[PDB]
Amino acid sequence: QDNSRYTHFLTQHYDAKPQGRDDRYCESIMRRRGLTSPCKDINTFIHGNKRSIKAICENKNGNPHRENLRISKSSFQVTTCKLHGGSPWPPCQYRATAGFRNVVVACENGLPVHLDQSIFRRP
Amino acid sequence: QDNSRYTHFLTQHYDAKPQGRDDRYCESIMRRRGLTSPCKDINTFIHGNKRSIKAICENKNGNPHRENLRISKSSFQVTTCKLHGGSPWPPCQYRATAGFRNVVVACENGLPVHLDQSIFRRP
C-alpha cells in the first residue's frame, strides 16, 4: 500500500514533455500506460514538472475545493484523451484535446492521489 | 471611441469584492450594471484586482489562445449568472455559479476589451 497511490497518479496522469498532443499521442500513451486494459473512456495527462503538481496540496499552489478535494491556483498544460468508438475492448481509438487550465486533485499525506475527471467532460 | 471598450469590460465583467455570490447577487448586479436591458442570457463577473486582469495581455499573466485571444496563467474567482426562465424581458431571474478558473479575454492596446463566455457554458 504505502505511497503506491501517488505513483498510480503519476502513471495515469502525468506526462512531463509530450511532443504533438494529437489523436496518435493519446493512443500510444494510453496503450503505453496500461489504460487500454479495457479502454478507459476518458483520461487526462498533466504536463510540466512534478514539483508544481505536488504543491497543489499545500496552500502554495492549492485551494480547498468541494468535499475533500483541492484545486490549483496555477494553470497546467493538459491533454485529454477521449474514447471514440462505443466499445471498451481494443482497438482503442482516442480523440485528443489539448488544453491549459487549473486542475482538481485529491491529496493524501501531501501527495496527489486522485485527479477529478469531470472538469474535462466538455460538451 | 478611445479606451471606452475597456471600461465596458470592467462594467460588464469586473466586480472587485462581492459578498455572497448567490442567485440574489446575480440579480442585483445584472440590474445594477444595465445588463437586464433585455435580459443577457449568461454573463460572468471576475473578482479581485484589476492589475491582474490587465496583465493577461502581457506575457506576465498571459498566453496566446486560438485566433486573436489570450488565456490567463493565474486563476481568478469568478461568478457566472445564468438566465433561468426562457423570456428576455424583465423580470430577469438569474441563477449563480461561483467558480475558480483562468480566463480567456481579448486584448486591445494592452487592455482587456472582451471576455470569452463560452468557457462558462458548463452542461
Swiss-Prot record, chains A, B:
Enzyme class: hydrolase
GO biological process: actin filament polymerization; angiogenesis; antibacterial humoral response; antimicrobial humoral immune response mediated by antimicrobial peptide; cell communication; cell migration; defense response to Gram-positive bacterium; hematopoietic stem cell proliferation
Tissue: Expressed predominantly in the liver. Also detected in endothelial cells and spinal cord neurons.
Active site: H13, H114
EC number of the protein: 3.1.27.-
Key words, A-Z: Amyotrophic lateral sclerosis, Angiogenesis, Cytoplasm, Developmental protein, Differentiation, Disease variant, Disulfide bond, DNA-binding, Endonuclease, Hydrolase, Neurodegeneration, Nuclease, Nucleus, Protein synthesis inhibitor, Pyrrolidone carboxylic acid, Secreted, Signal, Stress response
Result when mutating K54E: In ALS9; decreased interaction with the ribosome and ability to repress translation
Reported impact of N68D: Abolished binding to PLXNB2 receptor
Keyword check for NAD: no
Record motif Nucleolar localization signal, residues: 31-35
Positions of post-translational Pyrrolidone carboxylic acid modification: Q1
Effect of K17I: In ALS9; loss of angiogenic activity; reduced ribonucleolytic activity; retains nuclear translocation
Effect noted on mutating D116 to N/H/S/A: Strongly increased ribonuclease activity
Disulfide topology: C26-C81, C39-C92, C57-C107
Consequence recorded when altering Q12L: In ALS9; reduced ribonucleolytic activity; low angiogenic activity; reduced mitogenic activity; wild type far-UV CD spectra
Coiled coil ranges: none
Known outcome of mutating H13R: Found in a patient with Parkinson disease; uncertain significance
Effect after changing T80A: Increased ribonuclease activity
Entry function: Secreted ribonuclease that can either promote or restrict cell proliferation of target cells, depending on the context. Endocytosed in target cells via its receptor PLXNB2 and translocates to the cytoplasm or nucleus. Under stress conditions, localizes to the cytoplasm and promotes the assembly of stress granules (SGs): specifically cleaves a subset of tRNAs within anticodon loops to produce tRNA-derived stress-induced fragments (tiRNAs), resulting in translation repression and inhibition of cell proliferation. tiRNas also prevent formation of apoptosome, thereby promoting cell survival.
Disease: Amyotrophic lateral sclerosis 9: A neurodegenerative disorder affecting upper motor neurons in the brain and lower motor neurons in the brain stem and spinal cord, resulting in fatal paralysis. Sensory abnormalities are absent. The pathologic hallmarks of the disease include pallor of the corticospinal tract due to loss of motor neurons, presence of ubiquitin-positive inclusions within surviving motor neurons, and deposition of pathologic aggregates. The etiology of amyotrophic lateral sclerosis is likely to be multifactorial, involving both genetic and environmental factors.
Assembly information from the UniProt record: Homodimer. Interacts with RNH1; inhibiting ANG ribonuclease activity. Interacts with PCNA.
Name of this chain's protein: Angiogenin
The encoding gene: ANG
Shown segment, full-protein numbering: 25 to 147 of 147
